[PDB]
Write a protein that binds this ligand. Structure first.
Ligand SMILES: CCC(=O)N(c1ccccc1)C1CCN(CCc2ccccc2)CC1
Length: 113
């Protein structure tokens, strides 16, 4: 069992930045991938960014060059650096591993302008 804890979020303006963290606990050596997902009302949970153990990453085209996913190997934390924020980034953000299934509670992000 691996436990994931989302922290961060907030209310931002178009152009500002937020930093979300995802802290893993438990049998983290069986985790080879970590991803951030987001959801909006009426729409479906969609991928934002993913990172694997070697540090390679993929990004949704809507957040490429604005969002950055990174990891702290010593603290078992995956960060979502949300820069250059737009109103489209308003969503509840969720952390998940490569094993499909149990989500954390997520955290909320609102971007106004
Ligand atoms: C894509 C992510 C990834 O590869 N990980 C990760 C997972 C969740 C959240 C942050 C990072 C690793 C998990 C294992 N930790 C080391 C702990 C360890 C190592 C060796 C033996 C025993 C214990 C290194 C990072």
């Amino acid at each position: 069992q691996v436990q994931l804890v989302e922290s961060g979020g907030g209310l931002a303006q178009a152009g500002g930045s937020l930093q979300l963290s995802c802290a893993a606990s438990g049998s983290t050596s069986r985790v080879n991938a970590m991803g951030w997902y987001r959801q909006t009302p009426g729409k479906e949970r969609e991928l934002v960014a993913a990172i694997d153990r070697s540090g390679a990453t993929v990004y949704s085209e809507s957040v490429r060059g604005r969002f950055t996913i990174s990891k702290n190997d010593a603290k078992d934390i995956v960060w979502l650096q949300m820069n250059n924020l737009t109103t489209e980034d308003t969503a509840v953000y969720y952390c998940r591993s490569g094993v499909l299934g149990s989500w954390g509670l997520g955290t909320q992000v609102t971007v106004s302008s």
